Structure formats: C-alpha cells, structure tokens
Amino acid sequence: KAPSHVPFLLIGGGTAAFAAARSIRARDPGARVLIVSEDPELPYMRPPLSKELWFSDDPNVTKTLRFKQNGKERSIYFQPPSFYVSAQDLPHIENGGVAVLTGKKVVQLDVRDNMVKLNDGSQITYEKCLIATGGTPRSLSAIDRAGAEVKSRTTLFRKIGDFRSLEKISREVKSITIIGGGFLGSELACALGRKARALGTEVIQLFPEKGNMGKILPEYLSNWTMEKVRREGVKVMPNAIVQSVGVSSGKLLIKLKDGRKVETDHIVAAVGLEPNVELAKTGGLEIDSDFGGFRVNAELQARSNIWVAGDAACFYDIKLGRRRVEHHDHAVVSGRLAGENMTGAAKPYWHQSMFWSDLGPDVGYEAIGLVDSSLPTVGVFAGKGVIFYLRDKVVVGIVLWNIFNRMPIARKIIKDGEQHEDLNEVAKLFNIHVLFQ
Numbered sequence: 454k455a456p457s458h459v460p461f462l463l464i465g466g467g468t469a470a471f472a473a474a475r476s477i478r479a480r481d482p483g484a485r486v487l488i489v490s491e492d493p494e495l496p497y498m499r500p501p502l503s504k505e506l507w508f509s510d511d512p513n514v515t516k517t518l519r520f521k522q523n524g525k526e527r528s529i530y531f532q533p534p535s536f537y538v539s540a541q542d543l544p545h546i547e548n549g550g551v552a553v554l555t556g557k558k559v560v561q562l563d564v565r566d567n568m569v570k571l572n573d574g575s576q577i578t579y580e581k582c583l584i585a586t587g588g589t590p591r592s593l594s595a596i597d598r599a600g601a602e603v604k605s606r607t608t609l610f611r612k613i614g615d616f617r618s619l620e621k622i623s624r625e626v627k628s629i630t631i632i633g634g635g636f637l638g639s640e641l642a643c644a645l646g647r648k649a650r651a652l653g654t655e656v657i658q659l660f661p662e663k664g665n666m667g668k669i670l671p672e673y674l675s676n677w678t679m680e681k682v683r684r685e686g687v688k689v690m691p692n693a694i695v696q697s698v699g700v701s702s703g704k705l706l707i708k709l710k711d712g713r714k715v716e717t718d719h720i721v722a723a724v725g726l727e728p729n730v731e732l733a734k735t736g737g738l739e740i741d742s743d744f745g746g747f748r749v750n751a752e753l754q755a756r757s758n759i760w761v762a763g764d765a766a767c768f769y770d771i772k773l774g775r776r777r778v779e780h781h782d783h784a785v786v787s788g789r790l791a792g793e794n795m796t797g798a799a800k801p802y803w804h805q806s807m808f809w810s811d812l813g814p815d816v817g818y819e820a821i822g823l824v825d826s827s828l829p830t831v832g833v834f835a836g837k838g839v840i841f842y843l844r845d846k847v848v849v850g851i852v853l854w855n856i857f858n859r860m861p862i863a864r865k866i867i868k869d870g871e872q873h874e875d876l877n878e879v880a881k882l883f884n885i886h887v888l889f890q
C-alpha cells in the first residue's frame with residue numbers, strides 16, 4: 454500500500470498536517486503528498502467534539518458527525534474521502550494528490566537518510582517531511598494509582614471515539630464529574646450540562662483554581678465565567694485538589710485534599726496535553742525543555758528537510774519570543790506556513806493565529822497573542838469587553854469577551870508594538886465606550 458518513496462511526507466493526520474497538504478498542493482501544482490496517521494479516521498477538526506456536536510438537533514449526530522455552525526451544516530472532516538487518493542496509486546495518478554495512510558504509526562525517523570519506518574516494518578523515503586504529531590492527553594497521578602476499575606471509568610477526551618463513548622455515558626449514568634477547569638473542561642461541562650437538564654442527571658466540574666479558566670483569564674472574569682457554567686446546570690467545585698479516587702458502592706469516590714468527597718459514576722479528565730515527541734529520540738531532534746515539543750526556528754524548520762507544526766511545535770516568534778501553542782487556528786496557520794516553506798517559501802511565523810471558546814451559544818471568547826493570567830492585565834468592559842495582556846507597556850495579548858468580527862483589529866494592535874497611555878481609547882476600536890490585575 455504505502456509506496457517506497459514520496460516527495461512530501463506528513464507525519465500525523467490532524468489539523469496541521471491537513472493544512473500543510475492543502476498548502477503544498479496550492480503552492481506546488483501536481484505535488485504528491487502522503488499523510489501517515491495512526492488514527493483510523495481521515496483528518497478532522499476537534500473543536501466541534503466539545504461544542505457544536507453536543508448542541509445538535511439531529512439525534513443521529515453521533516453517526517453523521519455533522520453539525521450546524523452561521524447555521525450552515527457541515528462535516529467534522531476537513532474533506533470527504535473523494536478529495537483523497539490512495540497511497541498505492543499516489544505515485545502514478547496524473548497530477549498527483551493527497552493520500553492518507555490510516556492505522557499506521559511512524560515509529561522511527563532517520564534524518565540522515567530522509568527515511569521513516571512504520572509500526573509494520575515498512576520504510577518510506579521522503580524529500581520533505583513535516584512532523585505534525587500533536588499531543589496526548591495528560592492523566593492525573595491519582596487516577597494512575599486508582600486501579601483498572603477506576604481507569605476504565607475515566608475518559609481522556611480528544612478523539613471522535615471519546616465523544617461517542619462519553620455521549621453514550623451521558624445517556625446511561627446519573628452523574629459525570631469533569632476534572633479540569635480549562636477551556637476543554639469548561640466546554641464539556643456546558644455541553645454535558647445541557648444534556649443533563651433534559652435527562653435530569655448530574656454534572657460536576659472541579660479544579661484547583663479559584664474559578665474557570667483561572668490560568669488564562671483574570672480573576673474577576675474567571676469568577677463571572679464560573680457563574681455562567683453553574684447556570685448551565687453544572688455543580689462547579691473550585692479550589693479542589695484531587696487526593697485519591699476509589700470505588701465504593703459501585704460508584705466512583707473522589708477524595709479532595711481539603712476533606713470534601715464527591716461521589717460520581719464517570720470521570721472525564723481534562724488536565725492538559727503532552728507533545729508527542731517520541732520521534733525525537735531516533736531522529737536526534739532537539740526538544741525544548743521549557744515549553745516541551747520539537748524545537749524549531751521562526752520558519753518552523755528543525756533540520757534541512759524536516760519541519761514541525763501544530764501542538765508539537767515549539768517555535769521562535771520573532772515578535773513575541775519562543776512559544777508553543779496548542780490551538781486549532783495555530784495548527785492551520787503553522788501547518789499552512791510549513792507547507793509553503795516545504796516548497797521554498799522560507800517564511801517566518803508572522804501572521805498571529807487566534808483562538809476561541811464558546812460556552813454555549815451565549816458566552817463567546819476570542820483571543821490572540823500571549824494570554825496568561827500571570828501577565829498584568831487591563832480590562833475595559835461595557836457582558837462585553839476586551840482584556841489587554843501587557844509586557845513592558847506593550848500589549849502582547851488580547852482577549853475579546855463577547856466581541857466578534859474584530860480579530861483583525863486585535864492582530865494589528867499586537868503587531869504594531871505600540872505603547873498606549875490610555876487603553877480606554879484602544880478599547881474604542883472594539884466598540885467599547887476599568888479593572889486591573
């Protein structure tokens with residue numbers, strides 16, 4: 454099936470890989486691109502798995518994997534199978550194409566010989582290679598010590614299969630507990646909260662921070678967000694640190710360090726991500742000790758014929774410094790950029806990528822740049838506002854709270870690197886006419 458040589462080899466079949474394949478095909482007409490994906494599915498977008506797919510009117514959504522966005526229905530897959538060609542035919546099809554080798558994992562990378570070895574022993578030589586391996590969900594040490602019973606009833610949410618299995622659980626058990634206050638955990642709490650209001654079931658979200666998104670948003674806005682999640686039918690337990698997890702009367706028992714105890718039927722752990730850097734060993738590729746991931750330069754390049762994009766890429770931002778970003782749009786932007794550089798562009802990361810979060814069709818966040826609650830922040834509000842994240846009197850990150858269609862404005866503010874004595878005048882650029890942290 455897999456040919457012996459391919460011009461463009463993309464390792465990983467996710468968002469960054471697909472954006473690169475499209476970019477390569479657009480920049481190099483007739484290009485022959487092979488995606489190798491350990492997952493059995495073709496490249497698909499993940500944001501819907503914690504959002505639109507749960508708010509669908511169609512009860513066959515679990516099968517169709519179609520969702521309504523404003524309002525137009527679409528598939529979770531980036532392209533239908535008709536868009537792709539088979540790997541075996543990729544060398545011979547006139548004017549080339551894009552092929553996906555599913556159910557196959559690259560286990561060895563030989564940088565000197567421009568070659569990889571798959572889990573089945575097959576070997577593929579390449580001319581240009583992209584590493585777009587993404588990451589694997591983290592787990593809690595308390596769950597790793599809890600035993601097989603607890604582990605079998607704990608979900609690490611990332612893939613289509615995780616959505617299908619958790620959606621079935623939401624219709625079978627009476628209580629689900631989400632561990633993690635980040636965007637994924639909070640989105641899933643709002644999604645399961647909607648499903649639980651109709652079924653009369655329970656949804657719990659606990660995390661160590663004082664409020665939802667506490668590591669991202671300032672405290673005043675994190676607390677406002679916590680109240681909104683609570684009003685979606687969720688029992689939110691802030692300031693909760695898990696000490697142990699066990700099984701009691703057939704139910705899961707979560708013991709917190711502060712003495713509280715939570716009984717539940719199923720657990721969903723949304724506690725971050727680890728970059729998939731296993732190939733750095735055989736490949737002799739540098740890993741970044743500070744941010745994790747493959748260390749690459751501003752052009753996303755690691756070695757002469759190897760680039761890295763997406764969640765796994767720790768890159769140099771010429772304006773904001775060395776970073777590693779784990780956002781959907783960043784995978785598209787960095788994958789597209791890598792693709793262009795794999796066809797001779799030599800372009801640095803320049804167009805900043807944005808990210809967003811929806812806590813239902815009511816609350817919506819957009820953000821861009823260096824967004825960290827540790828940085829000093831200035832928030833101008835009017836249920837609506839903009840949060841400026843500062844560094845040396847220069848806005849380095851922006852959060853748009855219920856403000857839409859103004860990302861190009863935020864992108865220009867950060868690019869300009871200007872200093873501002875009255876950020877209230879900058880807030881007017883977002884149609885905002887007070888809080889510090």
Ligand SMILES: Cc1cc2nc3c(=O)[nH]c(=O)nc-3n(C[C@H](O)[C@H](O)[C@H](O)COP(=O)(O)OP(=O)(O)OC[C@H]3O[C@@H](n4cnc5c(N)ncnc54)[C@H](O)[C@@H]3O)c2cc1C
Pocket residue numbers: 464465466467468469470489490491492498499500501502503557558559560585586587588610611612637729732762763764765778779780781782784807808809810811
């Ligand atoms: C449920 C969910 C909701 C999200 N919602 C949002 C959102 O609303 N907004 C936002 O900005 N971001 C969101 N994100 C983040 C965004 O989806 C990720 O940043 C994006 O998917 C990263 O793209 P990627 O190509 O780098 O990695 P991935 O999408 O993880 O793709 C990597 C693929 O490569 C495979 N792979 C790994 N190693 C190998 C190997 N050795 N050989 C072969 N294949 C391999 C992995 O199995 C995976 O299939 C969400 C993520 C999840 C999971």
Ligand SMILES: Nc1ccnc2cc(Cl)ccc12
Pocket residue numbers: 503636637640779780781808809810811
């Ligand atoms: N709404 C989001 C914004 C950014 N990053 C996210 C990562 C995950 Cl895993 C889930 C949701 C996200």
